Amino acid sequence: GKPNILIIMVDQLNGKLFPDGPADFLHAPNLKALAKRSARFHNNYTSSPLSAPARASFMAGQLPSRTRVYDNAAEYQSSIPTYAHHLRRAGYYTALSGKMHLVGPDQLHGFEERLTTDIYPADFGWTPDYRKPGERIDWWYHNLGSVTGAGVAEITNQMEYDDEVAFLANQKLYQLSRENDDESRRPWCLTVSFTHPHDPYVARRKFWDLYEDCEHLTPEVGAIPLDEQDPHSQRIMLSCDYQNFDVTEENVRRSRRAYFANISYLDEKVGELIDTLTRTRMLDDTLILFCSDHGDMLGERGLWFKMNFFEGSARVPLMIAGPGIAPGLHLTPTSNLDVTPTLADLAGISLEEVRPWTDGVSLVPMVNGVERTEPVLMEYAAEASYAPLVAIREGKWKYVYCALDPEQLFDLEADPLELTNLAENPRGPVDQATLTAFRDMRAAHWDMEAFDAAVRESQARRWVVYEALRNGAYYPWDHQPLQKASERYMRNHMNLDTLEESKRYPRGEGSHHHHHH
Amino acid sequence: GKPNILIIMVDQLNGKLFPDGPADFLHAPNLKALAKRSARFHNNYTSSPLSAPARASFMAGQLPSRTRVYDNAAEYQSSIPTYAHHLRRAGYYTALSGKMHLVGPDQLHGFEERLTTDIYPADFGWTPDYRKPGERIDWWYHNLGSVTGAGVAEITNQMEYDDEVAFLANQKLYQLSRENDDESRRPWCLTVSFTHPHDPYVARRKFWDLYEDCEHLTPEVGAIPLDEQDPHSQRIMLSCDYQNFDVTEENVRRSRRAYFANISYLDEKVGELIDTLTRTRMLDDTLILFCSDHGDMLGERGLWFKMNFFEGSARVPLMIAGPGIAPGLHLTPTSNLDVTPTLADLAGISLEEVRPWTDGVSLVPMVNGVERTEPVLMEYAAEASYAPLVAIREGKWKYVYCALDPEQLFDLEADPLELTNLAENPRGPVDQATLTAFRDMRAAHWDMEAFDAAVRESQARRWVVYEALRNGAYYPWDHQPLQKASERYMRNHMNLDTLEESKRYPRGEGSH
Amino acid sequence: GKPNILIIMVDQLNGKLFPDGPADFLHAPNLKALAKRSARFHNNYTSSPLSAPARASFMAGQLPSRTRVYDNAAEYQSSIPTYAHHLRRAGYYTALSGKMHLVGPDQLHGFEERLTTDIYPADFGWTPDYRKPGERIDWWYHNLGSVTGAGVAEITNQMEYDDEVAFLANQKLYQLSRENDDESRRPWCLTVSFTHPHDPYVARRKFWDLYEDCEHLTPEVGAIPLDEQDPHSQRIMLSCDYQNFDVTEENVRRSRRAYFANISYLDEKVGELIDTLTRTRMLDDTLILFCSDHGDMLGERGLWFKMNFFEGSARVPLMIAGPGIAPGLHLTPTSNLDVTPTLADLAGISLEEVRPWTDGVSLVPMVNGVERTEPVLMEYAAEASYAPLVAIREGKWKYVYCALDPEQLFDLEADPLELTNLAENPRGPVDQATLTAFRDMRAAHWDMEAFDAAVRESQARRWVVYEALRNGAYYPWDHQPLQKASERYMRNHMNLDTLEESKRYPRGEGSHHHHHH
Ligand SMILES: C[N+](C)(C)CCO
Ligand SMILES: C[N+](C)(C)CCO
Ligand SMILES: C[N+](C)(C)CCO
Ligand SMILES: [Ca+2]
Ligand SMILES: [Ca+2]
Ligand SMILES: [Ca+2]
């Protein structure tokens, strides 16, 4: 009765590239086939445009202000329930292959098994410090060297990572298929979390070649000069060391080309996973979700990467396909915060069991024609912020607030590229009432003073602790997968014939000319 | 310049047994000689009368309301600085041998090396539930079978543990001595944390025999009937399943006898540590601390173990000896909360570096004759509480508050056994104004409604997660001491003569 | 400098299926391409028709009587030099992905790194016992259930293993390519050792479908009844529990069809390795060997699997390709015993440094047109033998001796299918004199009484020890691969940009130190 759940997650995928499933110009036949049978959430947003905050929030269905994972080095408490816990409590086998950027000594956070280590660190090294506004840390900050460095390679740090993530996810699916004839097996939930299309913007030749004739290599909004940028965008450019890189038109085109090429790299791995589900005969009983942690400005407005609430950074794709999911396109804004309650709903878990632990809403009713009215909230409190920023997405509007900056208000229906800041330049009385309305809702959801103080305390505490932990012998927190070789394959407490039968799936099949095995 | 630091910690040691170092009737020659040499804090209290809360608070110098380690299964966040971090940041090698009842995947919390696993669990299993007031969990709650089951054995779970804690601590001291002649060495801080004299009250014959003629086998206050007990004591007796145990006078004597015997068992281990320091020539450069996480009523008032603020449960000894420490007896109340700022002060760390992270005060000024006026605060929010309790200890007074119970106010100078509740029976207008003053102080320090809400959220959260974590394959968080065999002793990337010389200490010695 | 060496090994591959590279009827485009550019040894033999003895002898270039690895449970001493030692001593990084059926607590035998555990046991469980002739051990002996159970499945024990073997082999090549521009790098030798096409004869549907119209699904020589079999064949059929299986023609076809399908399964993995070598720019400096431990009778004569000296069981392919290797087909008999001295010769190691440690001869002279006259020797002393057997292969002749059985003498020129035993039915005085000459050679090479005594002592010794080791807590010897997660990918003792550059290969436009092609 309970469906299997395959979560396919990718990193830094601009949601505007999924207008209705993948954009037509992308070479993504597998993701395009998946989308045609999916509920597709067009205006879907991350909870925070940064990896560890987005992913802790994604796992728990809680905003960063609640998980306390403010930045890429903030400890994620083991006691915070995640969709892994909820599903595991409900009888699921739960596994992760790939990245989740969990910081702290808990590298599972409810997952029963984790098949790879993380690509990124698990310690407090990347802790920002609001006491030194304007500083940058060159050994890990984003810099525009990813833009000037884009190109072609046959292996990279990330391609090693994702190649392994995919192999072990498919291996696990093959292993799980051996139970497929047991009606009393546990349903499974496998999260497969790739690091592409995150930079470096570097792609295998095969996929780079797919985009030789690409007509989407120019961003839709050109570079805004530093002196004309809004303050947060200015902070982002300084954090990227913009003044020490000469980003040419060609650099922009090459970066976008490798990025699209790495989507096609991912599409092939999506196809592998679907193929494994199909041939092992678990496709029809498996829900498939496609999601990402945050987007990438990809040169739009002159900006790259994330760390802001503009569409290209804050929007991320979201699709759900499988049993009991009617395909279609949904335009109401939604959030990564809705994924954990949606997963619980699809798993048969009652609303009361998840209500105290989740800040979002289930999307299943929406899949079934029921309007969703809840606004979308977002937060940011890491590098290139000197104080926290919050945003609200509701109806056609986006509102952004930072105690240090002028407000931003965008009418995304009329101004999808967010070129006109209606808080600075209100069109009339309705714009003014709308700003008051969003100010009141902002004040209702966030105490920005308490938010700042909480972030400063978290940073300061971690810097004392991390300074200590980097003296003397280092104790690493990186997850080490363990697959006991002494229990695998054939060992001499076993019966070879029984082993071979148990590891074969499907079983008892095979006919040359006499079609009964 | 920076001294070495040896912290010796024991578990469940009633502080009333250290009036001026160990009480006369205890066979504790090694701890008595240490005490003559130490600043001794007579009226020292734990921050919380329970293992994990007291220990998380002890390491951080923060109360449970700040660490959020409310009970024996509450997660201790890795990001909370401890004295291990403070000393490590300042250039110390830091190590732990033995118990600290850290809950969560971090089993070091700043310690650079940990030589043993913990005796107790590292996961959320022992999480209380304020939604079910009155329940008890038989498979891990205290029960008076410790009292009826006291006796003599040559090995126990705890004796295996402590024998190993002791061996590895002395081994580590020996290993450290090999750097003692190196001017570029780091100073070291070794915490040696024993589980005795925590129950089961079971002792080796050798130490049991020391107390054949002991005159302290009867508690000073007898069993108070359930009807006549204060509400919290009633909760504790119910949690101990008291209705199903017939505790006789013999049981009480046998339990106390084994407890004293296990203090003597520890005293021999204290002697071993000091002997190693002496023969390795590290004694004179080493501060030595003696401390405990909480006490044990030991049958006084009819109660056993801890979980309350009465003297026998809330008082724990505290002594400090070594370079720059004037010996003496101090009567002003102190707290385990003061240990971390004291350690930092002794180690040369500035007050500013530790002020944002510690709720207590350094005891070094007191050691040097400066009056200390800060009150001592305590908290409890675990088994046998249905709502959090707080306590204030200041001057001659102890005040205890729980939203569910009548207040308690004791004048410990006039009523050292806390037999007269002056909140209930004021002696006069000074007692009345004193109660009002402590009420005002409590309200200024604690939002008790927020406290209860925070504890309930922590409990609920953990029960969701722990139920999940006990489905399928279990991933344990217990500490596994580091594996290092390929780098130990003689291996063929090394020169044998160089090895022998480096591992020999003292060096160049001998006299025929 | 010295060349890289990729050793592609497969298990239980009947050498008659590679008459000149792969037979025409096989779907094996990658191995046929490889064969076209290789020196191909048509009449190449295993040293012992069984996995562990063949593989210990292969690694050492020593016969079983010298390695003392007589059977699948015999300890292989760590002190015995292997091609891994020889190459590693000469400056090579050496690695193994996959199977080598090493028995004993040493699971590396000179390999610097092993990327997978073994599919098979590493302890003394499978020790035969000459004190009980006629017994069989049902929980691990071969049985004709492989033939009756042949068919189609998408995962098996062996495809899980070989999928993993392949993935990690290709990953290791990618990792090694990152050193390819460093002139201080070590040359590398990677052995990729697959368990297919060993039974179970079970194949993925994709590859099974390739052999729908196959014309080779029935053996040329059909089943010989027990009462007309030679004694050793009779012992093999009894060991296979042949009396309890009804092997139909359809069963024979299904088994051969799956077997061929698994050759095609392996051919796709060969193409994968070649593709990785090509795109990493490592192909042109890489010697590629293709080899197998023993063959598979595949129903010929009514026999299945190995354990004998007939062509289908004793012949295994051998090809060598790469720098300095002239392609060609060689008909002089060779042996797996020659691989280790050939590898050393090709790696630039002098003959004097390997001569005291190998029984075989380098094939490099033969590749360069020098005649080879050394005979090919083989030994067997495991299951289905009640006493050791030896064989001599020289010129057109094969001679087989066992103290318990009539001699066999075959003229492979006139009788390629070994249907006429010329020791029993000589054609004339030349056949008679040839038998005497092989008798004298046999007596000069082997003391068969001593051989039997040595195998009996080895068996008895292991059974005493194994009986003890299976009491109480078991201590496994299985190899546990370890890739330390605390040193992989991004960790906060590193600079992220330095990391990315080091892990990117090839290093072209956009990389730190590429200024031109
Ligand atoms: C991804 N970086 C590590 C480059 C910066 C944090 O987003
Ligand atoms: C586990 N016990 C409850 C028995 C002791 C800790 O309080
Ligand atoms: C391969 N078996 C394990 C089936 C028997 C030994 O060759
Ligand atoms: Ca990310
Ligand atoms: Ca305790
Ligand atoms: Ca084999």
Numbering used by the authors:
A (entry chain C), C (entry chain A): 4 to 520
B (entry chain B): 4 to 515
Sentences copied from the publication:
Choline-O-sulfatase (COSe; EC 3.1.6.6) is a member of the alkaline phosphatase (AP) superfamily, and its natural function is to hydrolyze choline-O-sulfate into choline and sulfate. Choline-O-sulfatase (COSe; EC 3.1.6.6) is responsible for the first step of this pathway, consisting of the breakdown of COS into choline. This enzyme belongs to the S1 family of sulfatases (subfamily 12) according to the SulfAtlas database. Like other arylsulfatases and phosphonate monoester hydrolases, SmeCOse is a mononuclear metalloenzyme. DLS experiments performed at pH 8.0 show a single peak in the particle-size distribution by intensity, with a hydrodynamic radius of 5.7 ± 2.1 nm, which corresponds to a globular protein size of 200 kDa, also supporting a tetrameric quaternary arrangement.
No detectable activity was observed for the C54A mutant, whereas the C54S mutant maintained a residual activity below 1%. The extra densities are not present in the C54S mutant structure, further supporting this PTM. Choline is placed at the bottom of the ‘aromatic tunnel’ both in the WT and the C54S mutant structures. In all cases, the quaternary ammonium (quat) moiety of choline appears to be sandwiched at approximately 3.5 Å from the aromatic rings of Trp129 and His145. The hydroxyl moiety of choline in this structure is 3.0–3.5 Å from Lys309, but also makes various water-mediated interactions with Glu386, Asn75 and the peptide bond of Ser54. Asp386 further occupied different positions in the C54S mutant structure. FGly needs then to be hydrated to a geminal diol, it being accepted that a water molecule reconstitutes the FGly diol after substrate hydrolysis. Our choline-bound C54S SmeCOSe structure shows a water molecule at a binding distance from the cation and Ser54, in approximately the same position at which the germinal diol of FGly appears in the WT structure; this water molecule is also at a binding distance from His201 and Lys309.
